[PDB]
Write a protein that binds this ligand. Structure first.
Ligand SMILES: O=C(c1nccs1)N1CC[C@@H](Nc2nccc(-n3cc(C4CC4)nc3-c3ccccc3)n2)C1
Length: 779
């Protein structure tokens, strides 16, 4: 294919003229029409020369015609002549393409292969991101940004290049842009006077991100100069407001270092930060003084420095992010004994009694600590995690205390249990058929199966020591709080995932998909499963050895109600096997077939379901990459399951490989300058459009993969005349924002912006995950 093409090569030193004409062709090209004159040049210099071209076979080469004329016979008969300036095999730069059609020559080509093309974009992109990220770490204003936030604003960087003698900023102008010099040298002028010279790693415009004031200097490139630039406009979309995020981060970091506020939820600490009174004080100023302090119980320093005293005795100096008042937060009726005096102009966060009660959900701090440390534990457990907040709150207040002494059988192997236990204090031994399995301690849990099943306990639980306290809830209370569908779900899920299964215990009933997916019965238990069989030989032959390892890893650790649950894997001489739950509600496509165009409530249900599944994967740094209705089943209750984890990757910085279904692939995948979890939120938009409008919004009626990609890249997004709902159109437009930086869901707040969109105003996210909503369709 390409082997033939290499014969035609010749080493031709590109003159000034040639680095011009190649620049034109690529600038007027689907994939290259948004690359800097720096990247177009780097690509331009990688172009091989060819003396002398294609047929109908697999091809990797993109050509820019130099010298002669080239006839393009489309169906084995002349279609059109092409001459100096023209290009062809555009598709080759995207993906391994079945060629457009044969192209003989009449009477020089510039050339490059896909592998070399994608690799150059990759190396350029990674190099540029890593440089910008290191530079952002040298800008002190961004110090209190989280790692995640720093990576987000790195994407916001725009490269700018400046000819010698070209103004970067003018004194008096109202710029909202910060510049970091990547290469070259600028002169700083103030009132037309030469002050100093900026160099590589220099930066200015910090104030321009925070205030709306005029430039204090004119800065002019002395030699050719490249800058990284952040605009306040883009920073605001990505972060919301820089100063607010910095002060919130300072406060939440401090609360996470406190031995009192440590043990509280991430939501509660964000409430405290967001609700805290923030005040400026002058220098050498008494802020808090002994008896004369009222409702203030805790302070965090945001700026400057204060000195803590107890009567006359200096205890220490608090600077940024340091805090005081644990004993006052614990004992809010005890008198304030300490003094706090500013050592300089400072900014302090004050947390009051009212702020503590409003955020920690109780007048009584020790009740709040007790509530949360019970909540933390069950919230990490599958069976409690997806209960509504009402159901959760009922379960937590149902917990009572009991005590045990060294050697006491808390549970006895063989007995019918009714109780779930959490360890308040002490250590217990778990013993199954006389063999110690493990020791459990403070905050560990046991016995949960008694909630779902009337069965013999499988192990004893024996108190290891005296003075052992457990919280307990009886199943009668759990069974009152829970409702039919969720209980059926848990009873079905836990039984089938914990059954020990051997290959000899399985028989096949029918083939489901075709390697092959079989419907299998476990003979001893009569439980049904799906079994995916992948050919060992087929995997070795497609160098997919590393990829199947990574599929098992991802499929294994998935534990979400709206994602397929793996039971275990098998292997023999010929196959790898996946044993999963059997999903029996058919395909999502069966549902939209029967239903037609979805109403707002049916669309809310299916998109919202998918959003919760995708949010779960992103939280564990997985990008799904193949989101489409085809890849979603329904269970017997009408709730969804994501099934196909072939395209899924753990995210190690930036991904670059082209994977997925062309109609659903995000522009940033196609353009090859790198992508992350964002691509799944683009696909979310393609899915919603299908749901409401009916057809796909891009390349709906196109056979040619290339014309699909063009429509995704440049096509006008329109709606049919029967789609008028402002909130539906707005959510779809924002999801199909081509630039991932300004796409909805893709900023600091993540999926919160999608969940809180007006499209979902009447939509109960708790009731969805809790299986309390009526689905669009059942069975
Ligand atoms: O609705 C039904 C049925 N109704 C009554 C009896 S069976 N089915 C829908 C598809 C089948 N259920 C199912 N459950 C889980 C996974 C799979 N499944 C299907 C596919 C097709 C090939 C793409 N792939 C899987 C699968 C199975 C195991 C691991 C990974 C994926 N199928 C049966």
């Amino acid at each position: 294919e390409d082997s033939l093409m290499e014969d035609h090569l010749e080493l031709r030193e590109k003159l000034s003229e040639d680095i011009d004409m190649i620049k034109t062709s690529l600038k007027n090209n689907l994939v290259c029409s948004t690359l800097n004159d720096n990247e177009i040049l780097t690509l331009s210099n990688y172009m091989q020369f060819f003396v002398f071209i294609k047929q109908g076979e697999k091809g990797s080469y993109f050509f820019i015609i130099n010298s002669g004329k080239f006839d393009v016979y489309v169906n084995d008969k002349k279609v059109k002549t092409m001459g100096k300036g023209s290009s062809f095999g555009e598709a080759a730069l995207i993906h391994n393409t079945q060629r457009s059609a044969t192209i003989i020559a009449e009477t020089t080509l510039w050339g490059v292969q896909r592998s070399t093309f994608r690799a150059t974009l990759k190396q350029l992109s990674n190099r540029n991101f890593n440089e910008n990220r290191t530079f952002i770490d040298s800008v002190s204003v961004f110090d209190m940004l989280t790692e995640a936030q720093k990576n987000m604003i790195t994407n916001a960087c725009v490269i700018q290049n400046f000819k010698s003698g070209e103004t970067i900023v003018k004194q008096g102008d109202y710029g909202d842009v910060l510049y970091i010099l990547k290469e070259g040298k600028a002169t700083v002028y103030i009132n037309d006077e030469e002050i100093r010279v900026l160099e590589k790693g220099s930066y200015f415009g910090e104030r321009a991100l925070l205030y709306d004031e005029p430039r204090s200097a004119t800065i002019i490139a002395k030699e050719p100069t490249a800058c990284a630039s952040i605009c306040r406009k883009l920073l605001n979309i990505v972060l919301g407001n820089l100063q607010v995020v910095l002060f919130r981060n300072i406060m939440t970091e401090a609360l996470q270092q406190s031995e009192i506020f440590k043990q509280f939820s991430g939501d509660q600490l964000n409430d405290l930060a967001d609700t805290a009174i923030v005040r400026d004080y002058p220098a050498n100023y008494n802020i808090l003084h002994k008896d004369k302090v009222k409702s203030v119980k805790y302070i965090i320093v945001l700026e400057g420095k204060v000195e803590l005293f107890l009567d006359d005795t200096s205890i220490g100096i608090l600077s940024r992010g340091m805090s005081f008042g644990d004993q006052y937060v614990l004992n809010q009726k005890q008198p304030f004994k300490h003094t706090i005096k500013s050592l300089e102009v400072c900014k302090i966060a004050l947390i009051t009694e009212t702020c503590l009660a409003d955020c920690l959900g109780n007048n009584n701090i020790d009740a709040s600590i007790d509530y949360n440390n019970k909540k933390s534990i069950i919230k990490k457990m599958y069976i409690f995690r997806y209960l509504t907040d009402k159901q959760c709150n009922l379960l937590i207040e149902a917990f009572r205390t009991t005590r045990y002494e060294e050697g006491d059988y808390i549970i006895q192997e063989g007995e019918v249990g009714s109780r779930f236990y959490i360890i308040k204090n002490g250590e217990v031994e778990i013993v199954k058929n006389k063999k110690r399995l493990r020791t459990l301690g403070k905050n560990d849990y046991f016995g949960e199966r008694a909630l779902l099943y009337d069965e013999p306990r499988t192990a004893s639980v024996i108190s290891k020591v005296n003075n052992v306290e457990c919280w307990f809830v009886d199943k009668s209370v759990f069974l009152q709080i829970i409702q039919g569908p969720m209980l059926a779900h848990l009873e079905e899920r836990i039984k089938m995932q914990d059954t020990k299964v051997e290959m000899d215990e399985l028989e096949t009933e029918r083939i489901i998909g075709r390697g092959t997916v079989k419907l299998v019965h476990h003979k001893p238990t009569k439980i049904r499963y799906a079994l995916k069989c992948v050919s060992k030989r087929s995997i070795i032959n497609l160098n997919q050895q590393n990829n199947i390892k990574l599929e098992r890893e991802i499929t294994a650790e998935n534990d979400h109600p709206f994602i397929i649950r793996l039971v275990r894997t098998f292997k023999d001489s010929k196959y790898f096997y996946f044993l999963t739950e059997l999903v029996t509600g058919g395909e999502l496509y069966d549902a939209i077939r029967k239903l037609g165009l979805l109403s707002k409530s049916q669309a809310q249900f299916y998109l919202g379901s998918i959003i919760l599944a995708i949010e779960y994967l992103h939280e564990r740094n997985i990008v799904y990459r193949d989101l489409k209705p085809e890849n979603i089943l329904l269970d017997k209750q009408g709730y969804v399951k994501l099934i196909d984890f072939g395209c899924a990757k753990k995210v190690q910085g930036r991904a670059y490989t082209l994977v997925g279904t062309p109609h659903y692939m995000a522009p940033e995948v196609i353009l090859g300058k790198g992508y992350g979890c964002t691509v799944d939120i683009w696909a979310l938009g393609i899915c919603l459009y299908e749901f409401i409008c009916g057809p796909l919004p891009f390349g709906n009626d196109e056979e040619d993969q290339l014309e699909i990609f063009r429509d995704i890249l440049t096509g006008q997004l329109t709606f049919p005349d029967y789609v008028t709902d402002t909130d539906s159109i707005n959510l779809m437009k924002r999801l199909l924002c081509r630039l991932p930086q300004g796409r909805i869901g893709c900023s600091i707040n993540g999926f919160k912006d999608i969940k809180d969109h007006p499209f979902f105003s009447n939509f109960n996210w708790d009731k969805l995950a809790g299986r309390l909503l009526d689905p669009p369709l059942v069975s």
